[PDB]
Ligand binder design. Structure first.
Ligand SMILES: [Mg+2]
Ligand SMILES: [Mg+2]
Ligand SMILES: [Mg+2]
Ligand SMILES: [Mg+2]
Ligand SMILES: [Mg+2]
Ligand SMILES: [Mg+2]
Ligand SMILES: [Mg+2]
Ligand SMILES: [Mg+2]
Ligand SMILES: [Mg+2]
Ligand SMILES: [Mg+2]
Ligand SMILES: [Mg+2]
Ligand SMILES: [Mg+2]
Ligand SMILES: [Mg+2]
Ligand SMILES: [Mg+2]
Ligand SMILES: [Mg+2]
Ligand SMILES: [Mg+2]
Ligand SMILES: [Mg+2]
Ligand SMILES: [Mg+2]
Ligand SMILES: [Mg+2]
Ligand SMILES: [Mg+2]
Ligand SMILES: [Mg+2]
Ligand SMILES: [Mg+2]
Ligand SMILES: [Mg+2]
Ligand SMILES: [Mg+2]
Lengths: 56, 53, 52, 125, 147, 187, 128
RNA sequence: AGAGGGCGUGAAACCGUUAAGAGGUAAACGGGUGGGGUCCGCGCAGUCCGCCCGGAGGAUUCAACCCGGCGGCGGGUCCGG
RNA sequence: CCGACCCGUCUUGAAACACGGACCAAGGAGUCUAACACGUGCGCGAGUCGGGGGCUCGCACGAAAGCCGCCGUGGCGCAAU
RNA sequence: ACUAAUCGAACCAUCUAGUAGCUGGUUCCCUCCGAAGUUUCCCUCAGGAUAGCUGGCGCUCUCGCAGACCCGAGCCACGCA
RNA sequence: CUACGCCGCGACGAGUAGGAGGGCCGCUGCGGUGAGCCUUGAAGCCUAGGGCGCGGGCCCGGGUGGAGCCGCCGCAGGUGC
C-alpha cells in the first residue's frame, strides 16, 4: 500500500492506456501494438484477435 | 609416410592421418539437391522497427 | 640458466605437421600466399630429374 | 578446396594489409582488392581479373581456365581489349554473363574496367 | 608466454589482486603443512582423513620384485595371441585347443573378470583365481600351472 | 531506476568451438547452416555438440556402440557420435554397422570395415541424411573420468565415498585417524 | 576543386575536448594521457560534480561517421605506389596519406599516380 | 662549428630576453559561451557524372558475314585416357 | 556565469590539526624452477610416452631436425581390497 | 665505566636477499559481473583454516523458432517463488 | 557474404576489494612476410600546425638531426610509474 496508488479504471481509461501505451510481450520482447496481427498471433487461441477484444 | 592403404615402410609404425571431413567443398555440399530439398524457404525480408504513431 | 628452454613435442604430432606442410606446399594459392612468385612455374609439385 | 584454402589464408597471407581499421588484399586477381572469400583471386577454381594494359591504353581481362589448377604457368588466359569504353564494358559483360563464368563478379569487373579506362584517359585542365 | 597472464592486466591496480585490507604478506598461517592439527585442522580432517597416526606392521627392506605379480582378466585373455589363432581354433574341426601363455605375455595371475567365448583353451599361468578357473573349465578349457 | 538483478544476464555457453581446427570449423559452418535452415532438432543437437570441449565429447567404445545399436528397432540406422569411436578389445564379434563419427581409431576402423560396416564423416552424414533421419545419436560416458571420483562431498565427511588426493596409495598414506574407530574416529 | 566523397553526412561528435588525466595540470611529471583514478578517496573516480570527466563507452561516435575526416573521407596510410592501387575501388570513400618517412622523389610519384587514379591525398604538397 | 679539444643528438625541471595577453578574493581545474591571435582550408563566384534532346566538327570503322586463335558449357562415353 | 578542498594510503569514517609527497629525468616491485589440482587446445587412444641411450658428411644455421622397435627398460593407465 | 667520536657485549667480512601474523609501495585503456566484516575450530583476539557472500567456465533441459510480404488456426511448458 | 562476416528486433548501463573478456593500446627481441621505408634524409627530439579514436594511443605537416627504421601473421619477455 505505501508504494502504490491504485483504483478502479473506467472504460475511457482502459481505452487510453491500451491505445496510447499498449505494448505486447511477444517472444519476451516489448513490441508496440501497431497491428491486430500482433495480438492475433499471441492471443488468437483465446478468441482475442484485435485491440477491441483486448480492451473488452 | 605411407599411403592411406599402406603404412610407411621407413617408419615402422606410421600411417597417414585421417580426415574428419572428406569433402571440404562447402559450396557444392550446400548446393547439392539433397541438402536443398530439406531446407525451409529463406526469410529474406527485413522487418525494421515501426514508429508507433 | 635452468629456464626450461627446450620443449618436447610428440613424434606423431611432428609427423602430422610435416604432412600438413607437405600437403600445403602443393596448393598454388598457399604457396602464392607465402609470396613465392610462382606465376610461371610449370607445375607446382615441381619435380626434376635426378641429374640435378 | 576453396573454403579450406580460405580458412588457411583468411588471416595469414602475404597479400594481406591491415591498416587504419581497414583490410585489403593485393593478390593479382582480386577485384575490389578486398580480403574476402568471394573476391579472393587465388583460392577459387575460376577467377576473373581486370588490369591495365602493358601500355597505358586498354584493359587486360584475365580468366582462370578449368584444367590446369595446379599448373600456374598455363592456368590464366589474358586477353587485351582496346576498344571504346562502351564496347569494352559490353565485352566484359558478355565474357562474365554469357559464359556464366562467375556471374557474381560481373559488376565488380565492369566497375574496375571503368575505373581503369577513366584513369587512362588524359587529364584535364 | 608472460603476455597472456594476469600480471599484464594488473598494471595500474595498486594491490595487484591481493586486496587492500589483508594485503599480500609473507607467510600467514605458517610454512608448508604447518598447523595441520592446530589451525588447519578443519582442512586436514575434511580433505585428508587418516593423515595422522600409524596403522599396521612396518617391514624393513621391502623388495618390490618379490611381490611382483601382474594380473590379466579373462575378458582380455584372448588378446594375448594373434587373431589367426582364435579364428583357426573356432573353425577347427577337431577339438584341439590353443595354448595361451600369460607368463610369456608378461602376466603371472589370471583373474576372472568378464566372460570367455564358447571355445576351449589351455591357459598357462603361475596363479589362477577360483572364478577364473571355473570359467575356463566352463568353456571346456583347462588351467595348467607354471613355476 | 529499474528493480532487476544483472548477475544472470549473460548466459554462459559455447557459441563456437574454442578450437582453431579448420576442418572442424568448416563442418561447424555446414551444421550452422543446417540447424538454421531446417526444423530438425538433430542438427541443433549436433551443432551444440560440435561446439563442446574434449571432456564434454568423451570417446565412445565399440562395445557400447554395438550394445546401443543392438536394441530393438534400431536396425539399418546410422550411429552418430560427435567424438571418437574407440576399439574395445573385450568384444569378440562385430556386427555390420553404419556409423558417423568425428574420429575413428585405426584399429576400430579396421574392425568395423572388416565386419562389412560403413564409416561416414559428418559432411557425408549431412549429404546422406540432412535432417538426421534414421539416426541413433549416441554419447560416450560423460562421467567416465577420473576427476569425478574426486568430485562430490569431501572425503572427511560421513557417507561420502569420494576419492581423496594422495600422492601414493599404501598403508602409511591417509589410513589412520578419521579412517578407523581405533584411531580417534571413522565417520 | 577537390575530389568529393560518395556521401557527406553530418558528423556529430559527442565530445570535442580531450579527456585529461586528473591532476595533470598541477604536475609536469603527470602527462595528460588518460589514466583511470583508483584512489580510495578520489573524487574524480567517485564522479563528484564539477570534476574532471572520465571516459566511458557512452561517448562513442556514431558507427556511420566513425573515423571520417572532416572532408568525409576515411584515411588509409600508403608507403609506395603499389599500396596506392588498393584504393582504386575504394576511391569514393577512402583517401591516402603518404607515410612521413617516404622520400620526396617517391612521394612525387605517389601523388601523380593518385591524381591519375582520382584518389584523394591529404598531404599532396608535403616535400617540395 | 646552430660539430670549436668533457666538442654526436641535446628532453624536462630551472633561468634570461623578446612578443602577445592579463592581474585586489593564492594559483590551478570541470561545463558553457564570448573576445582576441596564430595558423589551416589554392575559401573567395563554387562540384561532379550516367542517359537523353539540340547545334557545329572529326574519325576509325557500327551491326551483320569470312578466316584464324583462345576459352566456357554439353554430349548416349561420341573415342581414348 | 555556474560548479569545484590535495593527491596517495590505512580506516567505520580524510580536505583534515593523520602519515608520504619541493621539482624534473632515468631506474623501480607476482618472476623462474619443481610438485600438485582443475579448465581449455592438440595427437594417439586401452593404450600412451623415448625424456636416458644409440644411429645418421659431426659442427654456417645444426647444441637443431630425422630415425630406432628384439632400444618400451621403465613411468602412468588398464583392479581393487 | 672504558676497550680508536661505537659498549647492558667493539669493529670487519661471511652465513645473509636471515625471519616478520607488522608498516610502506606495487606501473596501460575500455567493457561485463561484483562482495565481506558473519558461523565453527585454532596459545586465536592486528593472523589463519572452515562455511557463507563473489567471479569464471560450462553442461542438461524447457518455450517456440513458422508461413518467401501478408496470414493463429475444455486445452495451451520441465519447474521455480 | 573479411560467415571470426553482415543484418534485424527488444531490454538494459552505479561500483571499492575482487574476478573475467576485448584491445587495429604501447615497449624490446626472434621466426616469417611487406620485390616495405631510408643520405632526394632513419631513429630521437621540438612545435600557437592538421586530424583520428570513448580511451590506452596513433597518423600526417614544419623544424632540428645525420644512419638506420617500421607495418602485418606468429613467437618470447628483465614489457607500461
Ligand atoms: Mg578494481
Ligand atoms: Mg584485518
Ligand atoms: Mg551491477
Ligand atoms: Mg577527440
Ligand atoms: Mg602535466
Ligand atoms: Mg572511502
Ligand atoms: Mg653537443
Ligand atoms: Mg621563455
Ligand atoms: Mg598510510
Ligand atoms: Mg580510527
Ligand atoms: Mg585522502
Ligand atoms: Mg581536524
Ligand atoms: Mg603529526
Ligand atoms: Mg603511519
Ligand atoms: Mg614531508
Ligand atoms: Mg622523495
Ligand atoms: Mg621510467
Ligand atoms: Mg635429436
Ligand atoms: Mg615392462
Ligand atoms: Mg592448542
Ligand atoms: Mg593495520
Ligand atoms: Mg538506466
Ligand atoms: Mg559498470
Ligand atoms: Mg620490471
Amino acid at each position: 500500500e505505501p508504494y502504490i496508488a491504485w483504483g478502479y479504471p473506467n472504460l475511457k481509461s482502459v481505452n487510453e492506456l491500451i491505445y496510447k501505451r499498449g505494448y505486447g510481450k511477444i517472444n519476451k520482447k516489448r513490441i508496440a501494438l501497431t497491428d491486430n496481427a500482433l495480438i492475433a498471433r499471441s492471443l488468437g487461441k483465446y478468441g482475442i484477435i484485435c485491440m477491441e477484444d483486448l480492451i473488452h | 609416410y605411407g599411403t592411406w592403404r599402406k603404412a610407411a615402410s621407413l617408419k615402422s609404425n606410421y600411417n597417414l592421418p585421417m580426415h574428419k571431413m572428406i569433402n571440404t567443398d562447402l559450396s557444392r555440399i550446400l548446393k547439392s539437391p539433397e541438402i536443398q530439398r530439406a531446407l525451409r524457404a529463406p526469410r529474406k525480408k527485413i522487418h525494421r522497427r515501426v514508429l508507433k504513431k | 640458466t635452468w629456464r626450461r628452454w627446450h620443449r618436447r613435442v610428440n613424434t606423431t604430432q611432428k609427423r602430422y605437421a610435416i604432412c600438413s606442410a607437405l600437403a600445403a606446399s602443393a596448393l598454388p594459392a598457399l604457396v602464392m600466399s607465402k609470396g613465392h612468385r610462382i606465376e610461371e612455374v610449370p607445375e607446382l609439385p615441381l619435380v626434376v630429374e635426378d641429374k640435378v | 578446396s576453396a573454403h579450406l584454402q580460405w580458412m588457411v589464408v583468411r588471416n595469414c597471407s602475404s597479400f594481406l594489409i591491415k591498416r587504419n581499421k581497414q583490410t585489403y588484399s593485393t593478390e593479382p586477381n582480386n577485384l575490389k582488392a578486398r580480403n574476402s572469400f568471394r573476391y579472393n583471386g587465388l583460392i577459387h577454381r575460376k577467377t576473373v581479373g581486370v588490369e591495365p594494359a602493358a601500355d597505358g591504353k586498354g584493359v587486360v581481362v584475365v580468366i582462370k581456365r578449368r584444367s590446369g589448377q595446379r599448373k600456374p604457368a598455363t592456368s590464366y588466359v589474358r586477353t587485351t581489349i582496346n576498344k571504346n569504353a562502351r564496347a569494352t564494358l559490353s565485352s566484359i559483360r558478355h565474357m562474365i554473363r554469357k559464359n556464366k563464368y562467375r556471374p557474381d563478379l560481373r559488376m565488380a569487373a565492369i566497375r574496375r574496367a571503368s575505373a581503369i579506362l577513366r584513369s587512362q584517359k588524359p587529364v584535364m585542365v | 608466454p608472460s603476455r597472456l597472464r594476469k600480471t599484464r592486466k594488473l598494471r595500474g591496480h595498486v594491490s595487484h589482486g591481493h586486496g587492500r585490507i589483508g594485503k599480500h604478506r609473507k607467510h600467514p598461517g605458517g610454512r608448508g603443512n604447518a598447523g595441520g592439527l592446530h589451525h588447519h585442522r578443519i582442512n586436514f580432517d575434511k580433505y585428508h582423513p587418516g593423515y595422522f597416526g600409524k596403522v599396521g606392521m612396518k617391514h624393513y627392506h621391502l623388495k618390490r620384485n618379490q611381490s611382483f605379480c601382474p594380473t590379466v582378466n579373462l575378458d582380455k585373455l584372448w588378446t594375448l595371441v594373434s587373431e589367426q589363432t582364435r579364428v583357426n581354433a573356432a573353425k577347427n574341426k577337431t577339438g584341439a585347443a590353443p595354448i595361451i601363455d600369460v607368463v610369456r605375455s608378461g602376466y603371472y595371475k589370471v583373474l576372472g573378470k568378464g566372460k570367455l567365448p564358447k571355445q576351449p583353451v589351455i591357459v598357462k599361468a603361475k596363479f589362477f583365481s577360483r572364478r577364473a578357473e571355473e570359467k575356463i573349465k566352463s568353456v571346456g578349457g583347462a588351467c595348467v600351472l607354471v613355476a | 531506476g529499474v528493480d532487476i538483478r544483472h548477475n544472470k544476464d549473460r548466459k554462459v555457453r559455447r557459441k563456437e568451438p574454442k578450437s582453431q581446427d579448420i576442418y572442424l570449423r568448416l563442418l561447424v559452418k555446414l551444421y550452422r547452416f543446417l540447424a538454421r535452415r531446417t526444423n530438425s532438432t538433430f542438427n541443433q543437437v549436433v551443432l551444440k555438440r560440435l561446439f563442446m570441449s574434449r571432456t564434454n565429447r568423451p570417446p565412445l567404445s565399440l562395445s557400447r556402440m554395438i550394445r546401443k545399436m543392438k536394441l530393438p528397432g534400431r536396425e539399418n540406422k546410422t550411429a552418430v557420435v560427435v567424438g571418437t569411436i574407440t576399439d574395445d578389445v573385450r568384444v569378440q564379434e562385430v556386427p555390420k554397422l553404419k556409423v558417423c563419427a568425428l574420429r575413428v581409431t585405426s584399429r576400430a576402423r579396421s574392425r568395423i570395415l572388416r565386419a562389412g560396416g560403413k564409416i561416414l564423416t559428418f559432411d557425408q552424414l549431412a549429404l546422406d541424411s540432412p535432417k538426421g533421419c534414421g539416426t541413433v545419436l549416441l554419447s560416450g560416458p560423460r562421467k567416465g573420468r577420473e576427476v569425478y571420483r574426486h568430485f562430490g562431498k569431501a572425503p572427511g565427511t560421513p557417507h561420502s565415498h569420494t576419492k581423496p588426493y594422495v600422492r601414493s596409495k599404501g598403508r602409511k598414506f591417509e589410513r589412520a585417524r578419521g579412517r578407523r574407530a581405533s584411531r580417534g574416529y571413522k565417520n | 576543386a577537390a575530389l568529393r566523397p560518395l556521401v557527406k553526412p553530418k558528423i556529430v561528435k559527442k565530445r570535442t575536448k580531450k579527456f585529461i588525466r586528473h591532476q595533470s595540470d598541477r604536475y609536469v611529471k603527470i602527462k595528460r594521457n588518460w589514466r583511470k583514478p583508483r584512489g580510495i578517496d578520489n573524487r574524480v573516480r567517485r564522479r563528484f560534480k564539477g570534476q574532471i570527466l572520465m571516459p566511458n563507452i557512452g561517448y562513442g561516435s556514431n558507427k556511420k561517421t566513425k573515423h571520417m575526416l572532416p572532408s568525409g573521407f576515411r584515411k588509409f596510410l600508403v608507403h609506395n605506389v603499389k599500396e596506392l592501387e588498393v584504393l582504386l575501388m575504394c576511391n569514393k570513400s577512402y583517401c591516402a596519406e603518404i607515410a612521413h618517412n617516404v622520400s620526396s622523389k617517391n612521394r612525387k610519384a605517389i601523388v601523380e599516380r593518385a591524381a591519375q587514379l582520382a584518389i584523394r591525398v591529404t598531404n599532396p604538397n608535403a616535400r617540395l
